[PDB]
Amino acid sequence: LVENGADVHLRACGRTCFYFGELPLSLAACTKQWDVVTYLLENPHQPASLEAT
């Protein structure tokens, strides 16, 4: 989904939720997934931002 092209800043909120964070990076970090976080910020031509809001 990243290699072909997408947006890594797709905010997810319109308010059965636990407030994982409106950014995909926060979702990948709250759930214990080191591989997804490591893949982000390094591989994509347009990587995510560690200081997003």
């Binding site: 059965t16 939720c17 636990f18 994982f20 759930t31």
Partner: protein
């Protein structure tokens, strides 16, 4: 339910069987997004259109 015995009463209410014995279960787990669980309990213990239900037996008898 009438005669105390909390352990067996609890086990019967929260009874889940995974496998070929699915139909004889009482609590069905459902879609689980993240750490959020959604359980479906069965209701044979409600007084709505059920005379002499579990709630009345616990409360009165």
């Amino acid at each position: 339910a009438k005669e105390g015995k909390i352990e067996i009463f609890r086990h019967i209410l929260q009874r889940e069987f995974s496998g070929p014995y699915q139909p004889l279960s009482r609590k069905f787990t459902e879609w689980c997004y993240g750490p959020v669980r959604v359980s479906l309990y069965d209701l044979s213990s409600v007084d709505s259109w059920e005379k002499n239900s579990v709630l009345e037996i616990i409360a009165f008898h």
